[PDB]
Amino acid sequence: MKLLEQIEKWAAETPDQTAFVWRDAKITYKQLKEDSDALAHWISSEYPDDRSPIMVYGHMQPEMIINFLGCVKAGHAYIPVDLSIPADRVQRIAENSGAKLLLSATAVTVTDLPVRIVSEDNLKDIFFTHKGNTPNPEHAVKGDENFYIIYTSGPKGVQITYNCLVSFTKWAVEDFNLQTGQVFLNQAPFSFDLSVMDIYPSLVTGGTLWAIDKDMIARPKDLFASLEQSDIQVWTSTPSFAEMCLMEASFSESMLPNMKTFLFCGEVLPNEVARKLIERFPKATIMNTYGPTEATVAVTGIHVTEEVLDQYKSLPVGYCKSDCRLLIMKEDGTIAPDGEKGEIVIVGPSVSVGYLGSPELTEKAFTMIDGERAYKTGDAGYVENGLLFYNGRLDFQIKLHGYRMELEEIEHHLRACSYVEGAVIVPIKKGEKYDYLLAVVVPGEHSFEKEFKLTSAIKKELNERLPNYMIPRKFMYQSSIPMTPNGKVDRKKLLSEVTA
Ligand SMILES: Nc1ncnc2c1ncn2[C@@H]1O[C@H](COP(=O)(O)OP(=O)(O)OP(=O)(O)O)[C@@H](O)[C@H]1O
């Protein structure tokens, strides 16, 4: 029943099954409950009637998960902080959030923070000192109490409650057709809510989380060696991450014979990427999902079949979970007729209760409609018979020749051209106005003897897809597209190197 109870069920039924593994470090469900219980018991003894959020610092160590559960068992929401988050932002989070404690298995490198730091051996000592102890079942986070708080770079703390997470997880477990005892890949740092899509569905279904870290990602040979040993069955990642893995010829069914489900969220999933996955993994089901962190990971989802790939050049993002609903709003706070583009607004139990301590910010994006919470995504899109389509971020809309064009739509067409394997549009601005567009593309196999031949071929094909003023003036070619630590296109890095 209760989220924690459905997880703990596996501690009793399959105590020795691995719950989380990172390189050679692993922990069973039995161990997870034990240490988590010990930590919650300790938290409860150190902060008797306190329920302040607790920071959990690290990368992919099993302790990250132990600490998450320990925090909620004592009634505290946790704040995931990845090692890749700049110290400056960590310092802010420590102050924006009334957190009084930070937990980390590894050494904390961020300059003195206004919180009690429990790390390294000090964390080990609580697992030992409180070994065998159990917390008051009644202290566990429940109802509309915060379960976790994830900050959205920008930096505001999105508060996700117990009800919010239960609403997402139940839907994920049912509609993503997960089973039990499956191996789940974890690619996203815990500071990115995409990780929630694999963490909880895995735990409630007695699965095994197989973590891949930053260093491994940097060393392809290590990365691919890990996947080969993983036996991963449920793959949760950003589209960019899968695309990079796709650059390796051995990334196929042969490497992951028991692959059964691909779950994507966070960015546009190119029709081309899905096609390649079906070819490489004819036994796997591909799911595209959409949603902002402010709406608890994702609210829409759709099975990307051959038929879907056939009728939608640009893949839809899915049907809204049944306990929530969508609204497409145009120019004014008026609702748009189905088919018309407008700003995507989400309403239902998946919507966050708001940004932590940010009144003005919450008032601008969060609203109440018929008694329930609503959230303006800032995303442009439309619906057709319950199916939601994503056009792009309003903030990314470029204007040239008095014409407005979603940046993402231009990338869609560039990506669709022959000889293009990966591509990003970098707008070059001359002040407040757009000067011209620069296309960064990863060339596919070709026989062009000189660069201009390739650029000419792409511009000609692109001329059949876009108005001339939408076609990028300059092209740059490179073997790969950079990703941020979260696994998304590093647009800022690209703008930087093109500017210079
Ligand atoms: N399936 C999808 N297809 C296209 N875009 C998607 C999809 N899923 C999510 N997105 C995009 O990602 C956004 C949500 O990402 P997230 O909440 O993790 O932070 P962010 O907006 O990307 O960056 P920041 O933290 O600065 O706000 C959505 O608003 C949408 O623009």
Ligand SMILES: [Ca+2]
């Ligand atoms: Ca956002």
